[PDB]
Amino acid sequence: RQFGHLTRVRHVITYSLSPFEQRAFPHYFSKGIPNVLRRTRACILRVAPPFVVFYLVYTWGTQEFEKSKRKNPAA
Amino acid sequence: ADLTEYLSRHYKAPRMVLAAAGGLEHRQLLDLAQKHFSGLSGTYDEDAVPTLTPCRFTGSEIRHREDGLPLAHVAIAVEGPGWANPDNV
Numbered sequence: 001r002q003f004g005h006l007t008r009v010r011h012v013i014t015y016s017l018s019p020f021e022q023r024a025f026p027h028y029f030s031k032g033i034p035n036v037l038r039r040t041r042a043c044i045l046r047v048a049p050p051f052v053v054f055y056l057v058y059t060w061g062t063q064e065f066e067k068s069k070r071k072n073p074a075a
Numbered sequence: 076a077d078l079t080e081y082l083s084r085h086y087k088a089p090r091m092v093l094a095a096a097g098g099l100e101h102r103q104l105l106d107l108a109q110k111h112f113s114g115l116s117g118t119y120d121e122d123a124v125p126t127l128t129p130c131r132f133t134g135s136e137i138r139h140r141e142d143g144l145p146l147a148h149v150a151i152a153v154e155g156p157g158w159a160n161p162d163n164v
Binding site for chain 2: 012016
């Protein structure tokens with residue numbers, strides 16, 4: 001793949017500014033923190049119900065291990 | 076009205092130059108300018124004086140992607156030195 005024959009684009013103006021006259025972290029603790037909280041909102045409903053189900057099965061597995069290796073009969 | 080404001084605020088006597096080049100003497104030109112340009116201006120509308128501001132050169136790129144054209148134009152530019160400095164020359 002070379003660089004220049006990818007597609008045909010009209011009707012587009014791209015503005016952009018130099019790296020120097022703009023700053024490093026514009027409103028970093030002002031917008032990036034609601035940014036990451038919104039990103040976490042978009043996922044955890046469909047990320048966590050695997051992991052907590054795994055977790056309860058893990059607790060139950062160790063539970064069955066201990067209560068079925070330690071038996072306490074009647075004798 | 077805005078035209079008349081612009082005409083009023085920028086067609087003023089001291090800033091502007093009448094200059095001739097050719098086969099003619101300075102006395103003739105001075106006398107004709109005395110007989111015609113006596114009476115244009117010299118005072119602003121309540122001292123609303125236009126004044127220069129030495130602005131700032133940003134440095135950036137604007138790229139207008141428009142592929143239905145035969146050739147591509149690039150202009151690259153940096154700071155201007157000014158006038159009176161010899162770095163001009």
